[PDB]
């Protein structure tokens, strides 16, 4: 929602965890795995983050693997 994102504030550190790891998300599975269960805390549309980490989701699924 174009509202307080609840999820927003964990998203941020996705994005800086990516950096400190030059952008290993990989790396970044861990803390990509708190805006999941973020995420997942709510109905979806709740977030524009978690509405783009259900389609991470999916992205990591589709690449069957930690890579990236």
Same mark, same amino acid.
């Given at each position: ?5 609840? +999820?927003?504030?964990?998203? +941020? =550190? &996705? /994005?800086?965890?990516? /950096?400190? %790891?030059? *952008?290993? $998300?990989?790396? +970044?599975?861990?803390? &990509?795995? =708190?805006?999941?269960?973020? +995420?997942? /805390? *709510? ?10 980490? =259900?389609? $991470? $989701? $999916? =992205? %990591? ?8």
């Amino acid at each position: 929602m174009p509202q307080k994102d609840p +999820c927003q504030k964990q998203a +941020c =550190e &996705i /994005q800086k965890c990516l /950096q400190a %790891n030059s *952008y290993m $998300e990989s790396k +970044c599975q861990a803390v &990509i795995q =708190e805006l999941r269960k973020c +995420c997942a /805390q *709510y109905p979806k549309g709740r977030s524009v983050v978690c509405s783009g980490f =259900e389609k $991470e $989701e $999916e =992205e %990591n699924l589709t690449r069957k693997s930690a890579s990236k």
